[PDB]
Amino acid sequence: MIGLVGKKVGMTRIFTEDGVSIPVTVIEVEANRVTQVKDLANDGYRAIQVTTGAKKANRVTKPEAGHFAKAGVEAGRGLWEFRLAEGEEFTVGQSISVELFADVKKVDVTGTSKGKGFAGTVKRWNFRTQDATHGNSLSHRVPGSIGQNQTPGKVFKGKKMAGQMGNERVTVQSLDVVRVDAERNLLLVKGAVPGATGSDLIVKPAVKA
Amino acid sequence: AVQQNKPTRSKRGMRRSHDALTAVTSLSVDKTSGEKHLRHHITADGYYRGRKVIAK
Amino acid sequence: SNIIKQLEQEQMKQDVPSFRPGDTVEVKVWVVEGSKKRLQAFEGVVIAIRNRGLHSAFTVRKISNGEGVERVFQTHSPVVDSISVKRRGAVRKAKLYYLRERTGKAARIKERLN
Amino acid sequence: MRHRKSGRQLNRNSSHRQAMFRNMAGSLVRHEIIKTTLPKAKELRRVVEPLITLAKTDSVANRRLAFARTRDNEIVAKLFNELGPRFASRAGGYTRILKCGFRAGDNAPMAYIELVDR
Amino acid sequence: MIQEQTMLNVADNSGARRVMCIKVLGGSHRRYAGVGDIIKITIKEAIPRGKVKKGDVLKAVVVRTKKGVRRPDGSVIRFDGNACVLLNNNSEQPIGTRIFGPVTRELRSEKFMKIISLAPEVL
RNA sequence: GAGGGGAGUGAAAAAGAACCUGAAACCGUGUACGUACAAGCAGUGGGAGCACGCUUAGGCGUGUGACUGCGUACCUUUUGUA
RNA sequence: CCGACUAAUGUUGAAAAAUUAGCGGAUGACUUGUGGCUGGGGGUGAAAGGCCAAUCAAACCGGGAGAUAGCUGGUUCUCCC
RNA sequence: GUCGAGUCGGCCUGCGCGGAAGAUGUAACGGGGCUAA
RNA sequence: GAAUACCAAGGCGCUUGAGAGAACUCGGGUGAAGGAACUAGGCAAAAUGGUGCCGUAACUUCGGGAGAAGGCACGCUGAUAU
RNA sequence: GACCUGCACGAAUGGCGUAAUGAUGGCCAGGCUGUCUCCACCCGAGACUCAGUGAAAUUGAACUCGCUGUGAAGAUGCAGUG
RNA sequence: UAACAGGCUGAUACCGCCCAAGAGUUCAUAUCGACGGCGGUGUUUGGCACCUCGAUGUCGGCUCAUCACAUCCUGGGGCUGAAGUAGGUCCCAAGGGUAUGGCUGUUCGCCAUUUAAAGUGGUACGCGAGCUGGGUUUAGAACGUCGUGAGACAGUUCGGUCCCUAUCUGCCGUGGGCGCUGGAGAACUGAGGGGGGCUGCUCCUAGUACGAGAGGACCGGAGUGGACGCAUCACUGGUGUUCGGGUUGUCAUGCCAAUGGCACUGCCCGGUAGCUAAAUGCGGAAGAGAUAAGUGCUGAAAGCAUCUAAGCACGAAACUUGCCCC
RNA sequence: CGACGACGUUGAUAGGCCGGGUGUGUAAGCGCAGCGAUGCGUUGAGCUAACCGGUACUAAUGAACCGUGAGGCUUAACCU
Numbered sequence A: 001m002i003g004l005v006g007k008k009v010g011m012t013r014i015f016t017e018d019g020v021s022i023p024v025t026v027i028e029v030e031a032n033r034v035t036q037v038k039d040l041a042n043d044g045y046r047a048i049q050v051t052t053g054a055k056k057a058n059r060v061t062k063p064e065a066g067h068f069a070k071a072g073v074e075a076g077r078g079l080w081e082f083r084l085a086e087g088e089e090f091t092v093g094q095s096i097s098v099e100l101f102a103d104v105k106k107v108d109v110t111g112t113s114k115g116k117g118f119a120g121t122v123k124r125w126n127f128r129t130q131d132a133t134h135g136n137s138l139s140h141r142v143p144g145s146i147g148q149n150q151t152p153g154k155v156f157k158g159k160k161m162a163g164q165m166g167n168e169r170v171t172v173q174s175l176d177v178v179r180v181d182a183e184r185n186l187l188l189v190k191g192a193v194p195g196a197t198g199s200d201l202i203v204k205p206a207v208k209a
Numbered sequence B: 001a002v003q004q005n006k007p008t009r010s011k012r013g014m015r016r017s018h019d020a021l022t023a024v025t026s027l028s029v030d031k032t033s034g035e036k037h038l039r040h041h042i043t044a045d046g047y048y049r050g051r052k053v054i055a056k
Numbered sequence C: 001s002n003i004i005k006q007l008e009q010e011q012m013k014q015d016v017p018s019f020r021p022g023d024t025v026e027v028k029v030w031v032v033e034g035s036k037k038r039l040q041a042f043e044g045v046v047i048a049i050r051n052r053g054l055h056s057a058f059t060v061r062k063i064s065n066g067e068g069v070e071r072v073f074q075t076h077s078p079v080v081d082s083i084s085v086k087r088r089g090a091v092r093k094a095k096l097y098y099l100r101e102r103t104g105k106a107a108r109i110k111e112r113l114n
Numbered sequence D: 001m002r003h004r005k006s007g008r009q010l011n012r013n014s015s016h017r018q019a020m021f022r023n024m025a026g027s028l029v030r031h032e033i034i035k036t037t038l039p040k041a042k043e044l045r046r047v048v049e050p051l052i053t054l055a056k057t058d059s060v061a062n063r064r065l066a067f068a069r070t071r072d073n074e075i076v077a078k079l080f081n082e083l084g085p086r087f088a089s090r091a092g093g094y095t096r097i098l099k100c101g102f103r104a105g106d107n108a109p110m111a112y113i114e115l116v117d118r
Numbered sequence E: 001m002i003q004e005q006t007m008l009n010v011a012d013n014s015g016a017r018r019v020m021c022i023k024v025l026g027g028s029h030r031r032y033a034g035v036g037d038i039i040k041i042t043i044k045e046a047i048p049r050g051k052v053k054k055g056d057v058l059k060a061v062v063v064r065t066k067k068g069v070r071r072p073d074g075s076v077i078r079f080d081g082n083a084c085v086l087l088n089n090n091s092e093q094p095i096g097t098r099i100f101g102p103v104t105r106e107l108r109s110e111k112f113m114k115i116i117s118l119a120p121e122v123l
Numbered sequence F: 001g002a003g004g005g006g007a008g009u010g011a012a013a014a015a016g017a018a019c020c021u022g023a024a025a026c027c028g029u030g031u032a033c034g035u036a037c038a039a040g041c042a043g044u045g046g047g048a049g050c051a052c053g054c055u056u057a058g059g060c061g062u063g064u065g066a067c068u069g070c071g072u073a074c075c076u077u078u079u080g081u082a
Numbered sequence G: 001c002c003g004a005c006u007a008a009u010g011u012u013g014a015a016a017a018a019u020u021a022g023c024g025g026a027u028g029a030c031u032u033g034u035g036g037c038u039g040g041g042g043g044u045g046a047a048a049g050g051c052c053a054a055u056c057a058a059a060c061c062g063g064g065a066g067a068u069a070g071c072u073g074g075u076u077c078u079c080c081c
Numbered sequence H: 001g002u003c004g005a006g007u008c009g010g011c012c013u014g015c016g017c018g019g020a021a022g023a024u025g026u027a028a029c030g031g032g033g034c035u036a037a
Numbered sequence I: 001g002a003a004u005a006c007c008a009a010g011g012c013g014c015u016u017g018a019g020a021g022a023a024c025u026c027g028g029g030u031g032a033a034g035g036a037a038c039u040a041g042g043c044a045a046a047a048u049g050g051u052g053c054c055g056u057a058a059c060u061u062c063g064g065g066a067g068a069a070g071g072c073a074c075g076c077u078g079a080u081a082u
Numbered sequence J: 001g002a003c004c005u006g007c008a009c010g011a012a013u014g015g016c017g018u019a020a021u022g023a024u025g026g027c028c029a030g031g032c033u034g035u036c037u038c039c040a041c042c043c044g045a046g047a048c049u050c051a052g053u054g055a056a057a058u059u060g061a062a063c064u065c066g067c068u069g070u071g072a073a074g075a076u077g078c079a080g081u082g
Numbered sequence K: 001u002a003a004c005a006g007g008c009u010g011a012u013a014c015c016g017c018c019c020a021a022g023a024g025u026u027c028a029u030a031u032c033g034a035c036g037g038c039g040g041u042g043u044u045u046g047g048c049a050c051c052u053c054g055a056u057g058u059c060g061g062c063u064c065a066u067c068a069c070a071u072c073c074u075g076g077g078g079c080u081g082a083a084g085u086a087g088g089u090c091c092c093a094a095g096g097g098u099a100u101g102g103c104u105g106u107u108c109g110c111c112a113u114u115u116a117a118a119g120u121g122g123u124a125c126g127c128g129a130g131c132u133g134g135g136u137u138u139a140g141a142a143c144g145u146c147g148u149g150a151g152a153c154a155g156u157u158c159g160g161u162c163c164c165u166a167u168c169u170g171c172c173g174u175g176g177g178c179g180c181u182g183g184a185g186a187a188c189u190g191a192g193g194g195g196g197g198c199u200g201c202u203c204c205u206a207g208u209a210c211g212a213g214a215g216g217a218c219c220g221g222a223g224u225g226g227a228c229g230c231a232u233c234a235c236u237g238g239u240g241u242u243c244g245g246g247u248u249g250u251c252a253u254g255c256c257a258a259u260g261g262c263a264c265u266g267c268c269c270g271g272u273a274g275c276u277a278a279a280u281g282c283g284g285a286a287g288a289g290a291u292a293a294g295u296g297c298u299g300a301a302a303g304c305a306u307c308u309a310a311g312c313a314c315g316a317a318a319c320u321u322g323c324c325c326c
Numbered sequence L: 001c002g003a004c005g006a007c008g009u010u011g012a013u014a015g016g017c018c019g020g021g022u023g024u025g026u027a028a029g030c031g032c033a034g035c036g037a038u039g040c041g042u043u044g045a046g047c048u049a050a051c052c053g054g055u056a057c058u059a060a061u062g063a064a065c066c067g068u069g070a071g072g073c074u075u076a077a078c079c080u
């Protein structure tokens, strides 16, 4: 099943009648405009490419503008692709809105996780700290050993060490759909989703179900 | 920790392959005084975007 | 953001009485014991108030059956059926955490005559 | 990480920064134009402009608030008697920063910061 | 939020006054016991003529914690101290006949209905 | 200012006082060729291509060296050393 | 003021023994300035082989002196048998 | 008593089968591959 | 009090600066719940901390132990007393 | 704290006690805590970037990969291979 | 030319197998296996002296691991002296998982209390240019003991300096160059690589099947946890020297009043955003393919029998996918 | 650090400014009561960072720079 591109508005709660507070991420899903349909004959696979939102005209380059104009669709802020299932058909220029999730119980949400910059092994990999005291010399958050001896005489590939953390694609799976609000272009899902307020999100019906 | 072998002049040059300075691509011309200046900076004679901002 | 403020405004209680730290309040909360739902009162001094729109909260301290207990209520939660001020207290701080180290006479709060 | 945080440390402690910007706001009010490093000029906006906004409303309490900041009654007097009136109809942006190259001693990026109607 | 070495007050008349958690039961590397959780204890102080003696090793169920419990609406209930009710090591039923101070609805279970019945107040 | 370019002296200033000759290590600028899918004592045997130049107009000379066979420095000490 | 019990730092140091937080003595067998005396198998030592000019199970400088070294290293152009 | 071409279990011998678990990586033909290579 | 804090007289900002606001190191501040479970060892850190008064055990060489332990009061204003 | 089976105590190279004293050795408790469960955030000095100055140990020469094997018997440099 | 580690060896050690006296009511072979026999590993105790004495830091802890499988748990299976429950024994299986404390320098061990389980080994008895430095193994001192004595003792006791700014390989991240054949902006495909893969308890099926009873299931389903991981900040909280306040000493702004500086942010009480765990969402799977041990169908060679030779079907956390990231 | 994303007057990119929120907890001044410390009123006052909604006041300058001008050979399938 295809998904939709939205935007992380933020989190709030829904109080139910029986006194449960449901933490929800509010996702603004404006209409997704189909900009290109890809088929097996021309592209080797079946997919739709969509756009959403809007971009200032002088920020749209002539190549991107020609691509939008061929679809007869106003320019959105980006282009995202969704693979098509067997019973799935779409037309160029078609608008797809958040009522797509009207009957969907659970969704997978993909965003770009917040960026922690250069992270140490303690933060990045949950390495334990060495002694704060008891004689420890300059080695309180340092990684410890990184290998063996002469055998093997090298560090193994994939060794956990300090480095860039976050600012990467992350998917959180099978979040409850709390509410679909077609009039306000809003999807509320229970729980946290990746990324900072205002960032793009990709929402698809849950793959695990 | 220190080298076991003397690095070559070749390796020294390869390392310095990123050390070259970059010249300012273009200077700007004040519309009133006609003098050259760094873009978004005032001129030597106290002009910015045609206005005599600083005297003396 | 306007979107989230709309979503929260639609959920907010419109009948919340005014109260201040140091007031004695009685909170009636729903308790479900089987298919039976009934109201249970929790009465004590307000030692903290968090003013945060739909997410507003307040903390009530009481000595109950020989034990000090604090309950942090979510103001706009349907679990809270009603709030009523039993006594206006006169204090000067926003947060009355110092009362945690007071008992009896040293824990008294002057009434706010107004 | 410094997400959403505001303010430059400027390789100083807070008390030093506070004193420095008190002095520098005094100098800008006195001379109406000063040369400093670009980052310091950008930080100085956030100190001087609220002082002018405060000076727009002349009262004993506002003069005392201006004195608690500034600690200079000549500066306070200039604020309330001249700058507030001069800027009475200007909604913010009482200062202008003009980049002016690099310092000889340390290649520090430099700028003039001036009052907009100087 | 009780762990090994935590001292607890006693909310029953079993005769113990102070006990110490020596194991959080019910899981490998399990760190903490909360309200409603069963711990292994040693009695560190006890009144002269009670049903239990200093140095006995037995079980207890935590019934009050400073960390407290959360409720479905997000509210919390916190207590000024940590307290437990001593349980027979095999049957895991209370040793005492009276329960002191308030307890919480988290103890409403088949195993701890007796504590709910005896408690003066359930929060 | 330092330093330099001229002018002049001188047989000579590339004898200018940081001064006869002015080697090598080491560091540059210029030109030719090679070099960004390629694994190791860096050479050696084979070898295309490019550039420059040669009195017979023919191949040759000089420089470079794609690709390819083989190939673990030297001394010392040792039964024996990459 | 005289010391130097613990830790961290520093360890191509700010320093060839320190800095910082703590620590001991602080009218005494105390501590300090100036000058004096004891000299190398000798001095001096509330004694650790401690100290005797960043040197101590025999100071430093010069001399015997090129001690001796059955040990280690090194030993320089070519070709022929 | 019943079917119509062999049946049985000892020996000697050629080639093979099991017995046969190890640590960075195939890793006990130098490799590819080979039923002959 | 020659301690300490802030100042006077007086003398100084320590002869590289400017930015940034990663890991990690150094020197510090604070920390939910727990409270020595850390570790060779409470190393380090945290803690105690003043004055007056009340009160203070075994033991003892009759001096001590002892500031044992433990506890109470403490600012400001007015009067007693311009 | 006892027992005595003192491998191998013992009476001025003193025996056994001993109040007081000790930056002395061992053990236990109250308090206290980031010592720890289990780390989080923060303030500063470095680390990072720009401008100025400008070291060091080491160094046969280097066109300085992994693996399995070989081999002066633990290989970037040998073989095969990735 | 010894002590450490490597190397060679494998007597010794550990593991496996062969024969089967006998135990096992009966019955060698459910389980065990005498007297003897044959191997595997490199794994203990050793042997040797090949590498290093112009130096290859040697116990234990900490941090961080990585591999083997002779498997501790979880998974699949045969036999049982397997009624059930729970066991024994062997086979397959390395995906993931696989205690915290008291004592002691300990490793180990014993002990307490957990757990589904608390695996066994290799990796310079992995890891000190990563930490420690309690132990061993300098100089001080003392005891016992030996010695006439200087001194000595894998006997004991109290004390006792752990350096290195990373050139190369490697590894975690992150750019610059050129290439990809006119140049450019985008969206992709997916060769290939990495991550992930754990599990308890409760309830139902069912007090059923089994069983004289005591007890008490398979198969299948439901919920809720421990540990781990990813994200996030709505909630609960920490921090919050950039916000507000209280307060001690002092100095100043002429003074009063009001303020500012300094004293660890002077000391404190609160606390915004952000960052964050103790906070709260989510995950491990299902399914599919090909299999292991194992079970079979049909079936001759060998008129029978036979899961196998021809053919055909099942079969596990291993393998290939499915899920996530590059 | 490079990098990556947004924005550059046809503009909400940042600062300021306006409104709000949040936090602290009733400013200053004046008045009243009290011999006074102080209390009370004006007053939930004053102040309020990194937050939310807005706003061209300030700063994001016209330019300039780089990058080119129809893109190899052969063969095949076609279009002429």
Ligand SMILES: [Mg+2]
Pocket: A114, A115, A116, A117, D001, D003
């Ligand atoms: Mg970031």
Ligand SMILES: [Mg+2]
Pocket: A128, A129
């Ligand atoms: Mg730890």
Ligand SMILES: [Mg+2]
Pocket: A137
């Ligand atoms: Mg050190």
Ligand SMILES: [Mg+2]
Pocket: A136, A137, A138, A139, A140
């Ligand atoms: Mg440290």
Ligand SMILES: [Mg+2]
Pocket: B004
């Ligand atoms: Mg070497």
Ligand SMILES: [Mg+2]
Pocket: B015, B016, B018, B019
């Ligand atoms: Mg460089």
Ligand SMILES: [Mg+2]
Pocket: D004, D005, D006
């Ligand atoms: Mg910001």
Ligand SMILES: [Mg+2]
Pocket: D011
């Ligand atoms: Mg600096």
Ligand SMILES: [Mg+2]
Pocket: D015
């Ligand atoms: Mg200060």
Ligand SMILES: [Mg+2]
Pocket: none
């Ligand atoms: Mg001249």
Ligand SMILES: [Mg+2]
Pocket: F020
């Ligand atoms: Mg001559």
Ligand SMILES: [Mg+2]
Pocket: F022
């Ligand atoms: Mg010359």
Ligand SMILES: [Mg+2]
Pocket: none
């Ligand atoms: Mg090439």
Ligand SMILES: [Mg+2]
Pocket: F037
């Ligand atoms: Mg290739």
Ligand SMILES: [Mg+2]
Pocket: F071
């Ligand atoms: Mg070769």
Ligand SMILES: [Mg+2]
Pocket: none
């Ligand atoms: Mg030899």
